[PDB]
Scaffold this active site. Structure first.
Site, PDB file in Angstrom:
ATOM      1  N   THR A 128       0.830  -1.208   0.000  1.00 36.21           N
ATOM      2  CA  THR A 128       0.000   0.000   0.000  1.00 36.21           C
ATOM      3  C   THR A 128       0.865   1.259   0.000  1.00 36.21           C
ATOM      4  O   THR A 128       0.415   2.328  -0.415  1.00 36.21           O
ATOM      5  CB  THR A 128      -0.967   0.059   1.197  1.00 36.21           C
ATOM      6  OG1 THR A 128      -0.231  -0.098   2.416  1.00 36.21           O
ATOM      7  CG2 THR A 128      -2.029  -1.021   1.083  1.00 36.21           C
ATOM      8  N   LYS A 135      -5.138   0.579  -0.439  1.00 34.55           N
ATOM      9  CA  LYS A 135      -5.742  -0.157   0.670  1.00 34.55           C
ATOM     10  C   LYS A 135      -6.125  -1.574   0.256  1.00 34.55           C
ATOM     11  O   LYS A 135      -6.778  -1.768  -0.779  1.00 34.55           O
ATOM     12  CB  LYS A 135      -7.002   0.559   1.181  1.00 34.55           C
ATOM     13  CG  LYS A 135      -7.474   0.051   2.538  1.00 34.55           C
ATOM     14  CD  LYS A 135      -8.927   0.391   2.787  1.00 34.55           C
ATOM     15  CE  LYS A 135      -9.306   0.177   4.255  1.00 34.55           C
ATOM     16  NZ  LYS A 135     -10.683   0.670   4.566  1.00 34.55           N
ATOM     17  N   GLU A 185     -22.994  -2.729   9.318  1.00 35.09           N
ATOM     18  CA  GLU A 185     -22.739  -1.955   8.120  1.00 35.09           C
ATOM     19  C   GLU A 185     -23.815  -2.016   7.037  1.00 35.09           C
ATOM     20  O   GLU A 185     -23.970  -3.029   6.354  1.00 35.09           O
ATOM     21  CB  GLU A 185     -21.373  -2.284   7.532  1.00 35.09           C
ATOM     22  CG  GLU A 185     -20.961  -1.290   6.446  1.00 35.09           C
ATOM     23  CD  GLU A 185     -19.478  -1.348   6.128  1.00 35.09           C
ATOM     24  OE1 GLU A 185     -18.785  -2.170   6.769  1.00 35.09           O
ATOM     25  OE2 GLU A 185     -19.008  -0.591   5.233  1.00 35.09           O
ATOM     26  N   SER A 203     -11.722   1.688  13.650  1.00 37.58           N
ATOM     27  CA  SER A 203     -12.313   1.049  14.824  1.00 37.58           C
ATOM     28  C   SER A 203     -11.464   1.289  16.036  1.00 37.58           C
ATOM     29  O   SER A 203     -10.265   1.448  15.920  1.00 37.58           O
ATOM     30  CB  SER A 203     -12.367  -0.469  14.633  1.00 37.58           C
ATOM     31  OG  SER A 203     -12.646  -0.816  13.296  1.00 37.58           O
ATOM     32  N   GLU A 229      -7.867   5.710   6.486  1.00 39.75           N
ATOM     33  CA  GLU A 229      -8.567   4.472   6.234  1.00 39.75           C
ATOM     34  C   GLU A 229      -9.942   4.833   5.734  1.00 39.75           C
ATOM     35  O   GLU A 229     -10.337   4.481   4.648  1.00 39.75           O
ATOM     36  CB  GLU A 229      -8.686   3.687   7.536  1.00 39.75           C
ATOM     37  CG  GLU A 229      -8.979   2.203   7.430  1.00 39.75           C
ATOM     38  CD  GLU A 229      -8.921   1.491   8.760  1.00 39.75           C
ATOM     39  OE1 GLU A 229      -8.240   1.967   9.649  1.00 39.75           O
ATOM     40  OE2 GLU A 229      -9.542   0.442   8.929  1.00 39.75           O
ATOM     41  N   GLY A 349     -12.234  -9.266   9.225  1.00 41.58           N
ATOM     42  CA  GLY A 349     -11.189  -8.621   8.431  1.00 41.58           C
ATOM     43  C   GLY A 349     -10.903  -7.193   8.862  1.00 41.58           C
ATOM     44  O   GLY A 349     -11.730  -6.557   9.519  1.00 41.58           O
ATOM     45  N   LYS A 368     -13.318  -7.991  16.645  1.00 39.45           N
ATOM     46  CA  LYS A 368     -14.416  -8.248  15.736  1.00 39.45           C
ATOM     47  C   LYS A 368     -14.921  -9.694  15.793  1.00 39.45           C
ATOM     48  O   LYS A 368     -16.126  -9.923  15.732  1.00 39.45           O
ATOM     49  CB  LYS A 368     -14.032  -7.875  14.318  1.00 39.45           C
ATOM     50  CG  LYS A 368     -13.642  -6.445  14.194  1.00 39.45           C
ATOM     51  CD  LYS A 368     -13.046  -6.192  12.818  1.00 39.45           C
ATOM     52  CE  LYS A 368     -12.719  -4.719  12.654  1.00 39.45           C
ATOM     53  NZ  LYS A 368     -12.386  -4.410  11.242  1.00 39.45           N
TER      54      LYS A 368
HETATM   55  C1  LIG Z   1     -14.024  -6.306   7.571  1.00 42.00           C
HETATM   56  C2  LIG Z   1     -14.839  -5.917   8.809  1.00 42.00           C
HETATM   57  O1  LIG Z   1     -15.310  -4.653   9.034  1.00 42.00           O
HETATM   58  C3  LIG Z   1     -15.105  -3.410   8.277  1.00 42.00           C
HETATM   59  C4  LIG Z   1     -16.085  -2.645   8.905  1.00 42.00           C
HETATM   60  C5  LIG Z   1     -15.818  -1.680   9.861  1.00 42.00           C
HETATM   61  C6  LIG Z   1     -14.507  -1.368  10.147  1.00 42.00           C
HETATM   62  C7  LIG Z   1     -13.451  -2.025   9.522  1.00 42.00           C
HETATM   63  C8  LIG Z   1     -12.149  -1.641   9.869  1.00 42.00           C
HETATM   64  O2  LIG Z   1     -11.995  -0.738  10.716  1.00 42.00           O
HETATM   65  O3  LIG Z   1     -11.136  -2.184   9.357  1.00 42.00           O
HETATM   66  C9  LIG Z   1     -13.646  -3.020   8.546  1.00 42.00           C
HETATM   67  O4  LIG Z   1     -13.089  -2.559   7.288  1.00 42.00           O
HETATM   68  C10 LIG Z   1     -15.201  -6.967   9.857  1.00 42.00           C
HETATM   69  O5  LIG Z   1     -15.874  -6.631  10.856  1.00 42.00           O
HETATM   70  O6  LIG Z   1     -14.829  -8.154   9.729  1.00 42.00           O
HETATM   71 MG   LIG Z   2      -9.917  -1.042  10.687  1.00 44.79          MG
HETATM   72 MG   LIG Z   3      -0.307   3.290  -2.426  1.00 45.83          MG
END
Ligand SMILES: C=C(O[C@H]1C=CC=C(C(=O)O)[C@@H]1O)C(=O)O
Ligand SMILES: [Mg+2]
Ligand SMILES: [Mg+2]
Length: 379
Positions: A128, A135, A185, A203, A229, A349, A368
């Site tokens: 990245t 990303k 989501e 998060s 992000e 993820g 998560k």
């Molecule tokens: C890929 C997920 O959430 C996405 C949703 C909110 C925040 C995320 C984050 O902060 O990385 C994730 O991209 C999961 O909960 O498994």
């Molecule tokens: Mg995250």
């Molecule tokens: Mg790049």
């Protein structure tokens, strides 16, 4: 104290909450190019809808899940019927539901484990920083084997009790399985001509006491790793929605939202779309988001395919419904599990940019996964 049967769809939402009964027609057709009514997907969908109304069913719905990779087959179907329920009534009954299942785990496997995962995070952070991708989101699994078949109804009760506010779903699969989860989501709601999407990204763990908690969120709002992000996600969908929406409002700054587990950054999108469009044409257009695959999409799709020692299938796809009149709701398939007999697989993820630490992401994905571990009464 009756629980839901494993062959019923269930969807709990502040928009529309319903269960379904029976099955009219299954719909395996891949959703690729679903953002385009000339697609075999939309055509067969339309066909099947007209087929269903001609067959006598008033107000057909199409419920189920679409996999992360839309070339793969879909888990959609028209039920014989459906039945609305009160989201608030359900939250209450679930909280009083008392009778559990004694369940002992005979195997628990993290796939992959800490060390391999951290190297996948390091190798993705580095790509990245280069021009190739901005990303990529990387996921991991927890496989659980239990010594008796898992009652999916009792578990759904527990999930609702622990997650009153999220988009809670329970979908019957073509093998005898159940996709089960508490997604925060929204990917796409269409209510008449109006639509919304509420992407998350970024998060922070929530805290036991409402002082160190109410600032953990304030800190998330400041955090630049998470804000970048988050920004990567919102700019992408702006562009994609440009020539698909009549009008479109998007805040340029995110806001805080809650999970029992996590603070997340959110950006609500509100707009109107043409009559050329439905809930699925729009959902197919948007998904997967840079919150679930990466940016650019197809370039992150490839990093993901070379780093992850598994196939995501329904994980990171979308789950929900849509009717014969352009309406519906679709949420991202995360904070979820696939169950079948005595076997469960959990999924989570993150969330990877140049500034992400491998321990950071390992532990994030950890928190998560605990949404679904808590439903099972595990840690
Ligand atoms: C890929 C997920 O959430 C996405 C949703 C909110 C925040 C995320 C984050 O902060 O990385 C994730 O991209 C999961 O909960 O498994
Ligand atoms: Mg995250
Ligand atoms: Mg790049």
């Amino acid at each position: 104290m009756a629980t839901l049967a494993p062959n019923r769809f269930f969807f709990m939402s502040p928009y529309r909450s319903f269960t379904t009964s029976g099955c009219f027609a299954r719909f395996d057709e891949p959703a690729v190019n679903g953002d385009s009514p000339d697609s075999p997907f939309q055509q067969k969908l339309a066909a099947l809808f007209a087929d269903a109304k001609a067959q006598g069913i008033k107000n057909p719905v199409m419920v189920g899940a679409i996999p992360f990779d839309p070339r793969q087959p879909s888990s959609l179907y028209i039920p014989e019927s459906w039945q609305s329920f009160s989201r608030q009534e359900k939250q209450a009954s679930a909280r009083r539901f008392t009778r559990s299942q004694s369940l002992n785990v005979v195997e628990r496997q993290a796939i992959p484990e800490q060390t391999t995962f951290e190297q996948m995070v390091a190798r993705a952070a580095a790509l990245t920083a280069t021009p190739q991708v901005d990303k990529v989101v990387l996921s991991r699994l927890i496989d659980i084997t239990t010594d008796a078949a898992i009652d999916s109804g009792v578990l759904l009760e527990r999930l609702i009790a622990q997650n009153p506010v999220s988009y809670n779903f329970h979908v019957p699969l073509a093998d005898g399985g159940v996709l089960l989860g508490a997604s925060p989501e929204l990917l796409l709601r269409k209510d008449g001509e109006r639509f919304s999407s509420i992407p998350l990204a970024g998060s922070a763990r929530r805290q036991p006491d409402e002082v160190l908690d109410r600032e953990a969120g304030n800190r998330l709002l400041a955090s630049e790793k998470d804000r970048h992000e988050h920004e990567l996600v919102t700019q992408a969908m702006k562009e994609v929605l440009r020539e698909r929406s009549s009008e479109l409002h998007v805040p340029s700054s995110p806001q805080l939202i809650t999970t029992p587990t996590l603070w997340h950054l959110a950006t609500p999108f509100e707009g109107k779309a043409n009559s050329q469009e439905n809930a699925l044409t729009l959902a197919c257009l948007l998904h997967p988001t840079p919150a679930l695959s990466g940016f650019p999409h197809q370039a992150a799709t490839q990093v993901i395919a070379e780093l992850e020692p598994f196939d995501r299938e329904l994980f990171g796809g979308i789950v929900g419904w849509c009717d014969s009149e352009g309406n519906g709701e679709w949420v991202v398939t995360i904070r979820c599990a696939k169950l079948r007999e005595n076997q469960v697989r959990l999924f989570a993820g993150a969330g990877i940019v140049p500034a992400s630490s491998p321990l950071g992401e390992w532990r994030e994905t950890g928190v998560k996964l605990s949404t679904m571990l808590n439903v099972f009464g595990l840690h």
